[PDB]
Design an enzyme around this catalytic site. Sequence first.
Site, PDB file in Angstrom:
ATOM      1  N   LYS A 160      -9.274  -5.362   9.232  1.00 52.87           N
ATOM      2  CA  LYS A 160      -8.803  -4.328   8.445  1.00 52.87           C
ATOM      3  C   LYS A 160      -8.286  -3.314   9.674  1.00 52.87           C
ATOM      4  O   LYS A 160      -6.956  -2.750   9.135  1.00 52.87           O
ATOM      5  CB  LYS A 160      -9.669  -3.687   7.429  1.00 52.87           C
ATOM      6  CG  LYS A 160     -10.443  -4.595   6.574  1.00 52.87           C
ATOM      7  CD  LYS A 160     -11.442  -3.769   5.734  1.00 52.87           C
ATOM      8  CE  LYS A 160     -12.183  -2.965   6.397  1.00 52.87           C
ATOM      9  NZ  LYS A 160     -13.680  -3.595   6.791  1.00 52.87           N
ATOM     10  N   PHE A 215     -16.278  -8.301  20.417  1.00 50.46           N
ATOM     11  CA  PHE A 215     -17.195  -8.508  21.078  1.00 50.46           C
ATOM     12  C   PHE A 215     -18.407  -8.805  20.130  1.00 50.46           C
ATOM     13  O   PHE A 215     -19.148  -9.534  20.286  1.00 50.46           O
ATOM     14  CB  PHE A 215     -17.126  -7.485  22.095  1.00 50.46           C
ATOM     15  CG  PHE A 215     -18.673  -7.281  22.880  1.00 50.46           C
ATOM     16  CD1 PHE A 215     -19.452  -8.213  23.381  1.00 50.46           C
ATOM     17  CD2 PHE A 215     -19.082  -6.087  22.607  1.00 50.46           C
ATOM     18  CE1 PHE A 215     -20.790  -7.992  24.057  1.00 50.46           C
ATOM     19  CE2 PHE A 215     -20.477  -5.627  23.304  1.00 50.46           C
ATOM     20  CZ  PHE A 215     -21.270  -6.575  23.941  1.00 50.46           C
ATOM     21  N   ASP A 220     -22.589 -11.383  17.256  1.00 54.30           N
ATOM     22  CA  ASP A 220     -23.289 -11.177  15.790  1.00 54.30           C
ATOM     23  C   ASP A 220     -23.289 -12.545  14.963  1.00 54.30           C
ATOM     24  O   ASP A 220     -24.354 -12.946  14.423  1.00 54.30           O
ATOM     25  CB  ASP A 220     -22.972 -10.029  15.129  1.00 54.30           C
ATOM     26  CG  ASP A 220     -23.485  -9.621  13.735  1.00 54.30           C
ATOM     27  OD1 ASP A 220     -24.300  -8.811  13.883  1.00 54.30           O
ATOM     28  OD2 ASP A 220     -23.092 -10.348  12.753  1.00 54.30           O
ATOM     29  N   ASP A 276     -26.661 -14.200  13.804  1.00 53.50           N
ATOM     30  CA  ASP A 276     -27.071 -14.249  12.456  1.00 53.50           C
ATOM     31  C   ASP A 276     -26.762 -15.620  12.031  1.00 53.50           C
ATOM     32  O   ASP A 276     -27.014 -16.122  10.676  1.00 53.50           O
ATOM     33  CB  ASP A 276     -25.911 -13.288  11.824  1.00 53.50           C
ATOM     34  CG  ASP A 276     -26.498 -11.782  11.925  1.00 53.50           C
ATOM     35  OD1 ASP A 276     -27.675 -11.840  12.511  1.00 53.50           O
ATOM     36  OD2 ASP A 276     -25.636 -10.944  11.545  1.00 53.50           O
ATOM     37  N   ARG A 299     -16.049 -15.928   9.270  1.00 52.42           N
ATOM     38  CA  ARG A 299     -15.627 -14.341   9.530  1.00 52.42           C
ATOM     39  C   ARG A 299     -14.092 -14.174   9.362  1.00 52.42           C
ATOM     40  O   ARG A 299     -13.436 -14.990   9.874  1.00 52.42           O
ATOM     41  CB  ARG A 299     -16.160 -14.108  10.842  1.00 52.42           C
ATOM     42  CG  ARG A 299     -15.453 -12.797  11.428  1.00 52.42           C
ATOM     43  CD  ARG A 299     -16.228 -11.447  11.140  1.00 52.42           C
ATOM     44  NE  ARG A 299     -17.578 -11.658  11.387  1.00 52.42           N
ATOM     45  CZ  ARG A 299     -18.431 -10.769  11.110  1.00 52.42           C
ATOM     46  NH1 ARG A 299     -18.314  -9.946  10.230  1.00 52.42           N
ATOM     47  NH2 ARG A 299     -19.887 -11.056  11.564  1.00 52.42           N
ATOM     48  N   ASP A 303     -32.459  -4.337  13.979  1.00 54.92           N
ATOM     49  CA  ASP A 303     -32.443  -5.268  12.907  1.00 54.92           C
ATOM     50  C   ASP A 303     -33.045  -6.602  13.234  1.00 54.92           C
ATOM     51  O   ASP A 303     -33.809  -7.221  12.322  1.00 54.92           O
ATOM     52  CB  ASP A 303     -30.754  -5.569  13.172  1.00 54.92           C
ATOM     53  CG  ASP A 303     -30.070  -5.599  11.803  1.00 54.92           C
ATOM     54  OD1 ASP A 303     -29.056  -6.702  11.759  1.00 54.92           O
ATOM     55  OD2 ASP A 303     -30.611  -5.094  10.769  1.00 54.92           O
ATOM     56  N   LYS A 321     -26.815   0.939  14.716  1.00 55.14           N
ATOM     57  CA  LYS A 321     -26.038  -0.624  14.994  1.00 55.14           C
ATOM     58  C   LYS A 321     -24.556  -0.548  14.391  1.00 55.14           C
ATOM     59  O   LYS A 321     -23.788  -1.171  14.350  1.00 55.14           O
ATOM     60  CB  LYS A 321     -26.723  -1.716  14.168  1.00 55.14           C
ATOM     61  CG  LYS A 321     -26.517  -1.742  12.791  1.00 55.14           C
ATOM     62  CD  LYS A 321     -26.623  -3.371  12.361  1.00 55.14           C
ATOM     63  CE  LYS A 321     -27.321  -3.771  11.095  1.00 55.14           C
ATOM     64  NZ  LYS A 321     -26.529  -4.184  10.008  1.00 55.14           N
ATOM     65  N   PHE A 371     -20.943   3.310   4.857  1.00 53.82           N
ATOM     66  CA  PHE A 371     -20.148   2.092   5.143  1.00 53.82           C
ATOM     67  C   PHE A 371     -21.157   0.925   5.205  1.00 53.82           C
ATOM     68  O   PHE A 371     -20.555   0.050   4.698  1.00 53.82           O
ATOM     69  CB  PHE A 371     -19.586   2.472   6.548  1.00 53.82           C
ATOM     70  CG  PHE A 371     -18.563   1.454   7.071  1.00 53.82           C
ATOM     71  CD1 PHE A 371     -17.261   1.482   6.100  1.00 53.82           C
ATOM     72  CD2 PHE A 371     -18.890   0.322   7.705  1.00 53.82           C
ATOM     73  CE1 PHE A 371     -16.509   0.304   6.631  1.00 53.82           C
ATOM     74  CE2 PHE A 371     -18.141  -0.672   8.118  1.00 53.82           C
ATOM     75  CZ  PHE A 371     -16.945  -0.667   7.278  1.00 53.82           C
ATOM     76  N   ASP A 392     -21.356  -2.445   2.983  1.00 59.55           N
ATOM     77  CA  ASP A 392     -21.112  -3.944   3.641  1.00 59.55           C
ATOM     78  C   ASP A 392     -22.445  -4.731   3.325  1.00 59.55           C
ATOM     79  O   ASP A 392     -22.340  -6.028   2.997  1.00 59.55           O
ATOM     80  CB  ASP A 392     -21.375  -3.601   5.027  1.00 59.55           C
ATOM     81  CG  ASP A 392     -21.231  -5.209   5.906  1.00 59.55           C
ATOM     82  OD1 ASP A 392     -19.956  -5.471   6.293  1.00 59.55           O
ATOM     83  OD2 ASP A 392     -22.262  -5.649   6.361  1.00 59.55           O
ATOM     84  N   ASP A 393     -23.648  -4.152   3.072  1.00 60.58           N
ATOM     85  CA  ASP A 393     -24.804  -4.763   2.427  1.00 60.58           C
ATOM     86  C   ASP A 393     -24.504  -5.322   1.226  1.00 60.58           C
ATOM     87  O   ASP A 393     -24.756  -6.378   0.743  1.00 60.58           O
ATOM     88  CB  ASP A 393     -25.876  -3.847   2.377  1.00 60.58           C
ATOM     89  CG  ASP A 393     -26.686  -3.707   3.930  1.00 60.58           C
ATOM     90  OD1 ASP A 393     -26.077  -4.428   4.894  1.00 60.58           O
ATOM     91  OD2 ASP A 393     -27.281  -2.768   4.022  1.00 60.58           O
TER      92      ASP A 393
HETATM   93  O1  LIG Z   1     -21.161  -8.085   7.774  1.00 61.52           O
HETATM   94  P1  LIG Z   1     -21.701  -7.947   9.320  1.00 61.52           P
HETATM   95  O2  LIG Z   1     -22.342  -9.386   9.368  1.00 61.52           O
HETATM   96  O3  LIG Z   1     -20.578  -8.021  10.430  1.00 61.52           O
HETATM   97  C1  LIG Z   1     -22.732  -6.417   9.985  1.00 61.52           C
HETATM   98  O4  LIG Z   1     -22.673  -5.632   9.166  1.00 61.52           O
HETATM   99  C2  LIG Z   1     -21.830  -6.136  11.125  1.00 61.52           C
HETATM  100  N1  LIG Z   1     -22.224  -5.605  12.205  1.00 61.52           N
HETATM  101  C3  LIG Z   1     -22.678  -4.244  12.021  1.00 61.52           C
HETATM  102  C4  LIG Z   1     -23.544  -3.474  12.808  1.00 61.52           C
HETATM  103  C5  LIG Z   1     -23.499  -4.046  14.157  1.00 61.52           C
HETATM  104  C6  LIG Z   1     -23.228  -5.231  14.516  1.00 61.52           C
HETATM  105  F1  LIG Z   1     -23.445  -5.693  15.716  1.00 61.52           F
HETATM  106  C7  LIG Z   1     -22.687  -6.056  13.366  1.00 61.52           C
HETATM  107  P2  LIG Z   1     -24.472  -6.968  10.318  1.00 61.52           P
HETATM  108  O5  LIG Z   1     -25.070  -5.840  11.201  1.00 61.52           O
HETATM  109  O6  LIG Z   1     -24.590  -8.296  10.940  1.00 61.52           O
HETATM  110  O7  LIG Z   1     -24.983  -7.114   9.158  1.00 61.52           O
HETATM  111 MG   LIG Z   2     -23.953 -10.641  10.630  1.00 63.87          MG
HETATM  112 MG   LIG Z   3     -23.505  -7.326   7.251  1.00 60.45          MG
HETATM  113 MG   LIG Z   4     -26.384  -8.389  12.261  1.00 64.11          MG
END
Ligand SMILES: O=P(O)(O)C(O)(C[n+]1cccc(F)c1)P(=O)(O)O
Ligand SMILES: [Mg+2]
Ligand SMILES: [Mg+2]
Ligand SMILES: [Mg+2]
Lengths: 336, 336
Positions: A43, A84, A89, A93, A98, A160, A186, A225, A229-230
Amino acid sequence: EKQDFVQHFSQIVRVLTEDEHPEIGDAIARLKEVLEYNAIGGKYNRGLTVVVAFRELVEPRKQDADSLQRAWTVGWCVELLQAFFLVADDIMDSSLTRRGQICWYQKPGVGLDAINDANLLEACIYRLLKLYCREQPYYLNLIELFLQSSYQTEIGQTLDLLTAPQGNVDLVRFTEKRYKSIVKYKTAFYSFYLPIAAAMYMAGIDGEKEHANAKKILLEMGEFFQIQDDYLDLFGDPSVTGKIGTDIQDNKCSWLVVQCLQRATPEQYQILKENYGQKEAEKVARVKALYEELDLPAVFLQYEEDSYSHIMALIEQYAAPLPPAVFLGLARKIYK
Amino acid sequence: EKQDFVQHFSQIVRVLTEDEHPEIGDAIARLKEVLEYNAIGGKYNRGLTVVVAFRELVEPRKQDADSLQRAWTVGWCVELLQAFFLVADDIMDSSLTRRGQICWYQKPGVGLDAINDANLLEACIYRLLKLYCREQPYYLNLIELFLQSSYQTEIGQTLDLLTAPQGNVDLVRFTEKRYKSIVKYKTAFYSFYLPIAAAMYMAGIDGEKEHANAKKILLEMGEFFQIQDDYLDLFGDPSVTGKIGTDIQDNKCSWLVVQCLQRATPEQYQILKENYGQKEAEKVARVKALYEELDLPAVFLQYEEDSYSHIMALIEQYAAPLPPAVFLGLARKIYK
Ligand SMILES: O=P(O)(O)C(O)(C[n+]1cccc(F)c1)P(=O)(O)O
Ligand SMILES: [Mg+2]
Ligand SMILES: [Mg+2]
Ligand SMILES: [Mg+2]
Ligand SMILES: O=P(O)(O)C(O)(C[n+]1cccc(F)c1)P(=O)(O)O
Ligand SMILES: [Mg+2]
Ligand SMILES: [Mg+2]
Ligand SMILES: [Mg+2]
């Protein structure tokens, strides 16, 4: 705003792939390949926030081409940081998609070399900064602003991953205090404080008290925010969000799960316990059922409004002496 | 030298884990845990090179406690960079052991979160730098020296991973030109130029021509260094090297393979081709057999001596106006 910002992306890419010591050509061709795939498709909320805050902070008469350019450049710096963090991530994860496409590390022929790829993206920020703002009196402050913001995020991320051990039901630790710190480190710092504080420093505003004041607003903003996202991780249209949720099977400490835990009966807790943090699709389906059972989406909606008001008071309380529109703008774009 | 350097490690760890915002305590406990496991157990050739070069560059009268401390601190900065690169390298190379113990990412309960762990280690460098040399007139130059050196390594690494695609016999590309550039970027810059150039800047020597002169020496030094690391990858006592070789099954562009290719007959080439870059143990065993067949170890030995002499001429040609012992020292510790 968005479009003029994106059109400057061809300048970013060409400059970072300028140099052509042709011994490294293949390496540079791969970098551009990494920039195209991971910087584009979001975005630009963060890159755009730098540009727009700059316009609302620097005297219009003082907005020469040169300085205007340094602004979107530093804007594409925040987007590179974003890129990055995302590339790495998605690996940690173990993500599938993405921004409406397969994760860079899921592409055939990439995999774990994406670790190096992400590092390069980190490197590019500092490459651009020296390449455009080196003779400016805010050079160190920007560099220092990106380094510390990176550290703060890595720390939040550590939090996290620590609160969501894999193979370990971690229900006990999903408290509010915990969630607040994770989100603060984070997400909030780099997504809300970083692009605005960069504009400030660029506008000659580097006082400690103003930055703290903006920070007070921006952090709480950043929290809301992440909470969004959650919610969207589970309750959102992937076609819209461009990715798919994993928090549940990833045994994450989400706002959601933190909310369920505060509303669930022993009978619901146990459902939660035997079902959260597991890869079994129906097990995941079980949890969403709980959440939907517990009226959490209304709850979230109630939060968004309760939150929106708090931040508003905050902007009221602390925006000065910055144009309030600096923050309102942000709040509007992230308030749906 | 080594021991006083290592004893300063408790100061590094405690300072980086100082802060105790107790919201991040668990995250800091994990950082220390990452520092202990990945910074300790190496030779300290790089950290030590900063300290020792500093002593041989700064007027003894000017070696106050404060300044002495900034020196080993910046020395532990080069060791942190090392640690960051290793933790991620071992993952991307899919390594089993490092420094006589299982790779950090092979530890039960770590795995791919080691990506974040490595990032933290990168972050720590800059944390120490601001924490000890912020009021010094070389602050920016050091920071800038670490950033660019990181970029150069990421680039070399990119080169590396590119020249060794997995599942793809890549024989054609193992040329000398190629090998030289990989090694220059991925090893030489950060392992040989970086710690010395940091001492220079700390001694007030920041002239462009001196740095280039030292660079001319240090790079070629760094090349020999990697060539040794390659020989040792295959031909060395793991108990001594603390890790096990993977270059062959990793289809790496090693000095070795580059040498075999320049000495092998068509019959040997084909042996190479059907055998390099594969996980089959006997297939790997096949290649070493080729190499041993081709007298490469004598060849390497012939190189070490031919190389040692070149560098020596180099130190002769370009050490001035630095004490020659600055380089001799290096050459002695890495000349077996
Ligand atoms: O929806 P995502 O997975 O991008 C996330 O909110 C992104 N993100 C947010 C904060 C730090 C980070 F390194 C990455 P998450 O934190 O992995 O849930
Ligand atoms: Mg993630
Ligand atoms: Mg997330
Ligand atoms: Mg994460
Ligand atoms: O013996 P290793 O595997 O440590 C190596 O020489 C280290 N290393 C050297 C240079 C850069 C790097 F990121 C890492 P390689 O390059 O992975 O073969
Ligand atoms: Mg390796
Ligand atoms: Mg490697
Ligand atoms: Mg090696």
